[PDB]
């Protein structure tokens, strides 16, 4: 006997190897997320401004560029 056991063992092994790959990928994803969440949080950490005419100057330049 003991032939069904070998089959089940083969099945479980495949499942276990899959569990390992999935666990590793889950870890990579969480770590990546922590790197990103830390970064953007870190960016928020860093410590008479009329802009109407400036905008106009830029639009005028674009106009002239198209007409050259």
């Amino acid at each position: 006997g003991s032939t069904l056991f070998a089959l089940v063992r083969t099945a479980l092994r495949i499942k276990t190897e899959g569990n390992l790959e999935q666990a590793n990928e889950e870890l990579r994803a969480i770590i990546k997320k922590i790197w990103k969440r830390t970064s953007m949080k870190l960016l928020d950490q860093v410590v008479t401004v009329g802009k109407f005419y400036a905008t106009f100057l830029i639009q005028e330049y674009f106009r002239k560029f198209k007409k050259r």
Binding site: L27, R28, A29, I31, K32, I34, W35, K36, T38, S39, M40, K41, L42, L43, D44, Q45, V46
Partner: protein
């Protein structure tokens, strides 16, 4: 948002559930206070209302998911810009030698109030260290900031 992903919306929805305890689709001042107290804070009934008012766009007194999402999409800035990554790197790279050492990342995390064991920190480095030299350069950091 479209600038937002299906995965992000899923994350936000889960975040929303952390507040909408009874899952009735809305966050009340009571549910908000319950979470704030669990976090060691003691808000006055007034401060809770003020918090709700911050995002209660239809003015009905409570926060629904669309309102929650509007705030999150707005506040959660995606540091993808080459400019954003650069500045991000500089902070991590304390001595500006072009490499993020485990030691540097360590301080950064402990300072930010982040709760990570020195082992989890080493794990962060190892996962980012593409060429395996034992530290994280700018390019590797770039890959880490912009990946799957």
């Amino acid at each position: 948002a479209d600038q937002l992903t299906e995965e992000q919306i899923a994350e936000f929805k889960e975040a929303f559930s952390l507040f909408d305890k009874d899952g009735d689709g809305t966050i009340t001042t009571k549910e908000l206070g319950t979470v704030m107290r669990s976090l060691g804070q003691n808000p006055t009934e007034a401060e809770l209302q003020d918090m709700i008012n911050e995002v209660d766009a239809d003015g009905n007194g409570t926060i629904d998911f669309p309102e929650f999402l509007t705030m999150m999409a707005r506040k959660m800035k995606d540091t993808d810009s080459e400019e954003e990554i650069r500045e991000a790197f500089r902070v991590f790279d304390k001595d500006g030698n072009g490499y993020i050492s485990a030691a540097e990342l360590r301080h950064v995390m402990t300072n930010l109030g982040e709760k990570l064991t020195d082992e989890e920190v080493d794990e962060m480095i190892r996962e980012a260290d593409i060429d395996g030299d034992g530290q994280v350069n700018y390019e590797e950091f770039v890959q880490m900031m912009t990946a799957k």
